[PDB]
Coordinates of all heavy atoms in Angstrom, one line a residue:
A15 N 0.9 -1.2 0.0 CA 0.0 0.0 0.0 C 0.9 1.2 0.0 O 2.0 1.1 0.4 CB -0.9 0.0 1.3
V16 N 0.3 2.3 -0.4 CA 1.1 3.6 -0.6 C 0.2 4.7 -0.2 O -0.9 4.7 -0.6 CB 1.7 3.8 -2.0 CG1 2.5 5.1 -2.1 CG2 2.6 2.7 -2.4
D17 N 0.8 5.6 0.7 CA -0.1 6.7 1.2 C 0.1 8.0 0.4 O 0.9 8.1 -0.6 CB 0.1 7.0 2.7 CG 1.5 7.4 3.1 OD1 2.3 7.8 2.3 OD2 1.8 7.4 4.3
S18 N -0.5 9.1 0.8 CA -0.4 10.4 0.1 C 1.0 11.0 0.1 O 1.4 11.7 -0.9 CB -1.4 11.4 0.7 OG -1.5 11.4 2.2
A19 N 1.9 10.7 1.1 CA 3.3 11.1 1.0 C 4.3 10.2 0.3 O 5.5 10.4 0.2 CB 3.8 11.4 2.5
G20 N 3.8 9.1 -0.2 CA 4.6 8.2 -0.9 C 5.2 7.1 -0.2 O 6.1 6.4 -0.6
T21 N 4.8 7.1 1.2 CA 5.3 6.0 2.1 C 4.7 4.7 1.6 O 3.5 4.6 1.4 CB 4.9 6.3 3.5 OG1 5.7 7.6 3.8 CG2 5.5 5.3 4.5
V22 N 5.6 3.7 1.5 CA 5.2 2.3 1.1 C 5.1 1.4 2.3 O 6.0 1.4 3.1 CB 6.2 1.8 0.1 CG1 5.9 0.4 -0.5 CG2 6.4 2.7 -1.2
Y23 N 4.0 0.6 2.3 CA 3.7 -0.3 3.4 C 3.5 -1.7 2.8 O 2.9 -1.9 1.9 CB 2.4 0.1 4.1 CG 2.4 1.5 4.7 CD1 2.1 2.5 3.8 CD2 2.4 1.6 6.0 CE1 2.0 3.8 4.3 CE2 2.5 3.0 6.5 CZ 2.2 4.0 5.7 OH 2.1 5.4 6.1
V24 N 4.3 -2.6 3.4 CA 4.4 -4.0 2.9 C 4.1 -5.0 4.0 O 4.7 -5.0 5.1 CB 5.8 -4.3 2.3 CG1 6.0 -5.7 1.8 CG2 6.0 -3.3 1.1
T25 N 3.4 -6.0 3.6 CA 3.2 -7.2 4.5 C 4.2 -8.3 4.2 O 4.4 -8.8 3.1 CB 1.8 -7.8 4.4 OG1 1.6 -8.2 3.0 CG2 0.7 -6.9 4.8
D26 N 5.1 -8.5 5.2 CA 6.3 -9.4 5.2 C 5.8 -10.7 5.7 O 5.9 -11.0 6.9 CB 7.4 -8.7 5.9 CG 8.7 -9.6 5.9 OD1 8.8 -10.5 5.0 OD2 9.7 -9.2 6.5
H27 N 5.1 -11.4 4.8 CA 4.3 -12.4 5.3 C 5.2 -13.5 5.9 O 4.8 -13.9 7.1 CB 3.5 -13.1 4.1 CG 3.6 -14.5 4.0 ND1 4.7 -15.2 3.6 CD2 2.7 -15.5 4.4 CE1 4.6 -16.6 3.8 NE2 3.3 -16.7 4.2
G28 N 6.3 -13.8 5.4 CA 7.2 -14.8 6.0 C 7.9 -14.4 7.4 O 8.3 -15.3 8.0
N29 N 8.0 -13.2 7.8 CA 8.5 -12.7 9.0 C 7.3 -12.2 9.8 O 7.6 -11.7 11.0 CB 9.5 -11.6 8.9 CG 10.7 -12.0 8.1 OD1 11.4 -13.0 8.6 ND2 11.1 -11.5 7.1
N30 N 6.1 -12.4 9.4 CA 4.9 -12.0 10.3 C 5.0 -10.6 10.7 O 4.7 -10.3 12.0 CB 4.8 -12.9 11.6 CG 4.2 -14.2 11.3 OD1 3.4 -14.3 10.4 ND2 4.6 -15.2 12.1
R31 N 5.3 -9.7 9.9 CA 5.4 -8.3 10.3 C 5.0 -7.4 9.1 O 4.9 -7.9 8.0 CB 6.8 -8.0 10.8 CG 7.8 -8.0 9.7 CD 9.2 -7.8 10.3 NE 10.1 -7.8 9.1 CZ 11.4 -7.4 9.0 NH1 12.0 -6.9 10.1 NH2 12.0 -7.5 7.9
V32 N 4.8 -6.2 9.4 CA 4.5 -5.2 8.4 C 5.5 -4.1 8.5 O 6.0 -3.6 9.6 CB 3.1 -4.5 8.7 CG1 2.8 -3.6 7.6 CG2 2.1 -5.6 8.8
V33 N 6.1 -3.7 7.4 CA 7.2 -2.7 7.3 C 6.8 -1.6 6.4 O 6.0 -1.7 5.5 CB 8.5 -3.4 6.8 CG1 8.9 -4.6 7.7 CG2 8.3 -4.0 5.4
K34 N 7.3 -0.4 6.8 CA 7.2 0.8 5.9 C 8.5 1.5 5.6 O 9.5 1.4 6.3 CB 6.2 1.7 6.5 CG 6.8 2.4 7.7 CD 5.8 3.5 8.2 CE 6.0 3.7 9.7 NZ 5.1 4.7 10.1
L35 N 8.4 2.2 4.5 CA 9.5 2.9 3.9 C 9.1 4.2 3.3 O 8.3 4.2 2.4 CB 10.3 2.0 2.7 CG 11.6 2.5 2.1 CD1 12.6 2.6 3.3 CD2 12.0 1.5 1.0
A36 N 9.7 5.3 3.8 CA 9.4 6.5 3.1 C 10.0 6.7 1.8 O 11.0 6.1 1.5 CB 9.8 7.7 4.2
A37 N 9.3 7.5 1.0 CA 9.9 7.8 -0.3 C 11.4 8.3 -0.3 O 11.7 9.3 0.4 CB 9.0 8.8 -1.0
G38 N 12.2 7.6 -1.0 CA 13.7 7.8 -1.1 C 14.4 7.5 0.2 O 15.7 7.5 0.2
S39 N 13.7 7.0 1.3 CA 14.1 6.8 2.6 C 15.1 5.6 2.6 O 14.9 4.7 1.9 CB 13.0 6.7 3.6 OG 13.4 7.0 5.0
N40 N 16.0 5.7 3.6 CA 17.1 4.7 3.6 C 16.7 3.5 4.3 O 16.9 2.4 3.9 CB 18.5 5.3 4.0 CG 18.5 6.4 5.1 OD1 17.6 6.4 6.0 ND2 19.3 7.3 5.0
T41 N 16.3 3.6 5.6 CA 16.0 2.5 6.3 C 14.5 2.4 6.6 O 13.8 3.4 6.7 CB 16.8 2.6 7.7 OG1 18.2 3.1 7.3 CG2 17.0 1.1 8.3
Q42 N 14.1 1.2 6.8 CA 12.7 0.9 7.0 C 12.3 0.9 8.5 O 13.2 0.9 9.3 CB 12.4 -0.6 6.5 CG 13.1 -1.6 7.2 CD 12.8 -3.0 6.7 OE1 12.4 -3.2 5.6 NE2 13.2 -4.1 7.5
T43 N 11.0 1.0 8.8 CA 10.5 0.8 10.1 C 9.6 -0.4 10.1 O 8.7 -0.5 9.2 CB 9.7 2.1 10.5 OG1 10.4 3.2 10.6 CG2 9.1 1.9 11.9
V44 N 9.7 -1.2 11.1 CA 8.8 -2.3 11.5 C 7.6 -1.7 12.4 O 7.8 -1.0 13.4 CB 9.5 -3.4 12.2 CG1 8.4 -4.5 12.5 CG2 10.6 -3.8 11.3
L45 N 6.3 -1.7 11.8 CA 5.2 -1.2 12.5 C 4.9 -2.0 13.8 O 5.0 -3.3 13.7 CB 4.0 -1.1 11.6 CG 4.0 -0.1 10.6 CD1 5.0 -0.4 9.5 CD2 2.6 -0.1 9.9
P46 N 4.5 -1.4 14.9 CA 4.2 -2.2 16.1 C 3.0 -3.0 16.2 O 2.2 -2.9 17.2 CB 4.2 -1.1 17.2 CG 3.7 0.0 16.4 CD 4.4 0.0 15.1
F47 N 2.6 -3.8 15.1 CA 1.6 -4.7 15.2 C 2.1 -5.9 16.0 O 3.4 -6.1 16.1 CB 1.2 -5.3 13.8 CG 0.5 -4.3 13.0 CD1 1.0 -3.7 11.9 CD2 -0.9 -4.1 13.2 CE1 0.4 -2.8 11.1 CE2 -1.6 -3.2 12.4 CZ -1.0 -2.6 11.4
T48 N 1.2 -6.6 16.7 CA 1.6 -7.8 17.4 C 0.7 -9.0 17.2 O -0.5 -8.9 16.8 CB 1.4 -7.5 19.0 OG1 0.2 -7.0 19.2 CG2 2.5 -6.4 19.4
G49 N 1.2 -10.2 17.5 CA 0.5 -11.3 17.3 C -0.1 -11.7 16.0 O -1.1 -12.5 15.9

């Protein structure tokens, strides 16, 4: 998924997590979903 600022959100199905990456941004953030 992609928001209005160009941030990309991805389901990392194999690692059971959700990550996001800002446009042109260097490092990703893992979103604090649980379980």
Side-chain angles (χ1 to χ4, degrees):
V16 179
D17 65 13
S18 45
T21 299
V22 178
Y23 302 76
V24 174
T25 59
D26 187 8
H27 131 288
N29 297 302
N30 281 329
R31 65 184 185 169
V32 186
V33 303
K34 71 176 152 176
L35 185 58
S39 203
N40 33 35
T41 322
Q42 66 177 22
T43 297
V44 180
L45 287 69
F47 285 107
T48 55

